[PDB]
Amino acid sequence: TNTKGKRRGTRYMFSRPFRKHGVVPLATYMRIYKKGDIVDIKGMGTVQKGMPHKCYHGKTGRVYNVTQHAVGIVVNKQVKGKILAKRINVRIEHIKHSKSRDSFLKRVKENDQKKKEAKEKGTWVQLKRQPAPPREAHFVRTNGKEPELLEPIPYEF
Protein backbone atom coordinates (compact mmCIF):
# COMPACT_ATOMS: atom_id res chain seq x y z
CA THR A 1 0.00 0.00 0.00
CA ASN A 2 2.43 2.64 1.19
CA THR A 3 5.92 1.13 0.81
CA LYS A 4 7.28 0.40 4.29
CA GLY A 5 10.89 1.07 3.24
CA LYS A 6 13.76 2.66 5.11
CA ARG A 7 14.71 6.16 3.89
CA ARG A 8 11.29 6.85 2.41
CA GLY A 9 10.01 10.33 3.20
CA THR A 10 13.44 11.92 3.26
CA ARG A 11 13.74 13.90 0.05
CA TYR A 12 14.53 17.06 2.02
CA MET A 13 15.71 15.95 5.46
CA PHE A 14 18.60 13.68 4.52
CA SER A 15 19.72 16.47 2.23
CA ARG A 16 22.48 18.97 2.83
CA PRO A 17 20.64 22.29 3.15
CA PHE A 18 21.77 24.68 0.37
CA ARG A 19 25.33 25.64 -0.58
CA LYS A 20 26.74 23.60 2.32
CA HIS A 21 27.63 20.47 0.37
CA GLY A 22 31.01 18.79 0.15
CA VAL A 23 33.21 17.06 2.67
CA VAL A 24 32.09 17.62 6.25
CA PRO A 25 33.99 19.95 8.60
CA LEU A 26 36.38 18.46 11.09
CA ALA A 27 35.22 19.90 14.41
CA THR A 28 32.21 17.57 14.09
CA TYR A 29 34.59 14.66 14.55
CA MET A 30 36.43 16.48 17.36
CA ARG A 31 33.43 16.36 19.70
CA ILE A 32 33.67 14.42 22.94
CA TYR A 33 30.64 12.41 24.06
CA LYS A 34 30.61 10.76 27.45
CA LYS A 35 27.99 8.65 29.17
CA GLY A 36 24.80 10.46 30.06
CA ASP A 37 25.40 13.30 27.60
CA ILE A 38 22.20 14.70 26.12
CA VAL A 39 22.54 14.65 22.34
CA ASP A 40 20.09 15.50 19.59
CA ILE A 41 19.71 13.48 16.41
CA LYS A 42 19.96 15.02 12.93
CA GLY A 43 20.84 12.64 10.12
CA MET A 44 22.99 14.16 7.40
CA GLY A 45 23.23 12.99 3.83
CA THR A 46 26.92 12.73 3.00
CA VAL A 47 27.82 9.93 5.41
CA GLN A 48 25.88 6.80 4.52
CA LYS A 49 26.65 4.33 7.26
CA GLY A 50 25.11 5.26 10.56
CA MET A 51 21.99 7.24 9.80
CA PRO A 52 19.48 6.24 12.46
CA HIS A 53 16.02 6.20 10.86
CA LYS A 54 13.59 8.96 10.00
CA CYS A 55 11.73 8.20 13.24
CA TYR A 56 14.46 9.86 15.32
CA HIS A 57 15.56 12.82 13.20
CA GLY A 58 14.87 15.87 15.33
CA LYS A 59 14.72 14.01 18.63
CA THR A 60 16.98 14.06 21.65
CA GLY A 61 18.39 11.24 23.72
CA ARG A 62 21.05 10.20 26.20
CA VAL A 63 24.36 8.43 25.71
CA TYR A 64 24.83 5.01 27.27
CA ASN A 65 27.50 3.56 24.96
CA VAL A 66 30.53 5.14 23.28
CA THR A 67 32.17 3.25 20.42
CA GLN A 68 35.00 4.05 17.97
CA HIS A 69 32.80 5.74 15.38
CA ALA A 70 29.38 5.90 16.99
CA VAL A 71 27.36 6.42 20.15
CA GLY A 72 24.51 4.42 21.67
CA ILE A 73 21.56 6.70 22.30
CA VAL A 74 18.40 5.92 24.24
CA VAL A 75 15.54 8.00 22.81
CA ASN A 76 11.85 7.98 23.59
CA LYS A 77 9.80 6.95 20.57
CA GLN A 78 6.03 7.28 20.19
CA VAL A 79 4.44 4.04 19.11
CA LYS A 80 0.62 4.02 19.10
CA GLY A 81 -0.65 4.20 22.67
CA LYS A 82 2.57 4.29 24.68
CA ILE A 83 6.13 5.47 24.47
CA LEU A 84 9.18 3.21 24.53
CA ALA A 85 12.83 3.80 25.35
CA LYS A 86 14.62 2.66 22.22
CA ARG A 87 18.40 2.38 22.10
CA ILE A 88 19.72 3.38 18.68
CA ASN A 89 23.32 3.21 17.45
CA VAL A 90 24.11 6.39 15.50
CA ARG A 91 27.43 7.43 13.99
CA ILE A 92 29.07 10.55 15.26
CA GLU A 93 28.28 12.84 12.30
CA HIS A 94 24.51 12.63 12.71
CA ILE A 95 24.51 13.86 16.32
CA LYS A 96 25.67 16.98 18.14
CA HIS A 97 25.59 18.42 21.63
CA SER A 98 22.14 19.56 22.67
CA LYS A 99 22.16 22.91 24.46
CA SER A 100 18.80 22.09 26.05
CA ARG A 101 20.24 21.51 29.52
CA ASP A 102 22.94 24.17 29.27
CA SER A 103 20.60 26.92 30.44
CA PHE A 104 20.11 24.80 33.56
CA LEU A 105 23.80 24.05 34.08
CA LYS A 106 24.47 27.79 34.05
CA ARG A 107 21.86 28.51 36.74
CA VAL A 108 23.02 25.74 38.97
CA LYS A 109 26.42 27.46 38.79
CA GLU A 110 25.23 31.05 39.29
CA ASN A 111 22.70 29.83 41.86
CA ASP A 112 25.06 28.04 44.25
CA GLN A 113 27.66 30.81 44.11
CA LYS A 114 24.82 33.23 44.85
CA LYS A 115 23.30 31.01 47.55
CA LYS A 116 26.42 31.27 49.71
CA GLU A 117 26.84 34.91 48.62
CA ALA A 118 23.80 35.80 50.75
CA LYS A 119 24.53 33.22 53.47
CA GLU A 120 27.62 35.30 54.31
CA LYS A 121 25.53 38.49 54.20
CA GLY A 122 22.15 37.47 55.61
CA THR A 123 19.54 38.25 52.96
CA TRP A 124 16.50 36.72 51.26
CA VAL A 125 17.43 36.79 47.57
CA GLN A 126 14.71 34.29 46.44
CA LEU A 127 16.62 32.63 43.60
CA LYS A 128 13.54 30.74 42.33
CA ARG A 129 12.38 32.16 39.02
CA GLN A 130 9.00 33.69 38.34
CA PRO A 131 7.34 34.05 34.93
CA ALA A 132 6.70 37.48 33.42
CA PRO A 133 4.73 39.53 35.96
CA PRO A 134 2.11 42.17 35.17
CA ARG A 135 3.70 45.53 34.47
CA GLU A 136 4.64 48.06 37.13
CA ALA A 137 2.51 51.15 37.67
CA HIS A 138 4.74 53.50 35.69
CA PHE A 139 4.33 57.12 34.67
CA VAL A 140 4.67 58.07 31.01
CA ARG A 141 5.77 61.52 29.89
CA THR A 142 4.37 63.49 26.97
CA ASN A 143 6.76 66.42 27.36
CA GLY A 144 5.79 69.48 25.36
CA LYS A 145 4.18 67.90 22.32
CA GLU A 146 0.74 66.37 21.80
CA PRO A 147 -0.38 62.80 20.99
CA GLU A 148 -0.56 62.51 17.22
CA LEU A 149 -4.04 61.99 15.80
CA LEU A 150 -4.35 59.16 13.30
CA GLU A 151 -7.47 58.18 11.38
CA PRO A 152 -8.33 55.24 9.10
CA ILE A 153 -7.42 56.02 5.48
CA PRO A 154 -9.93 55.72 2.59
CA TYR A 155 -10.19 52.73 0.27
CA GLU A 156 -8.57 52.60 -3.15
CA PHE A 157 -7.65 49.83 -5.59
**Which of residues 26, 27, 29, 50 is near RNA by CB under 7 A?**
50
Report chain breaks in the chain, C–N > 2.5 Å, as residues after which they occur.
Answer: none
Task: Region of 116 please: left (phi>0), alpha (psi -120 to 50) or beta.
Answer: alpha
70 binds RNA, rule: CB under 7 A: yes
28 binds RNA, rule: CB under 7 A: no
* Per-residue contact flags (x/-) with RNA for residues 108 to 137, judged by CB under 7 A: x--xx--x--x-----xxxxxxxx------
Nearer to RNA, 27 or 153 (CB): 27
Question: Per CB under 7 A, which region of 32-40, 136-144, 145-153 contacts RNA?
Answer: 32-40
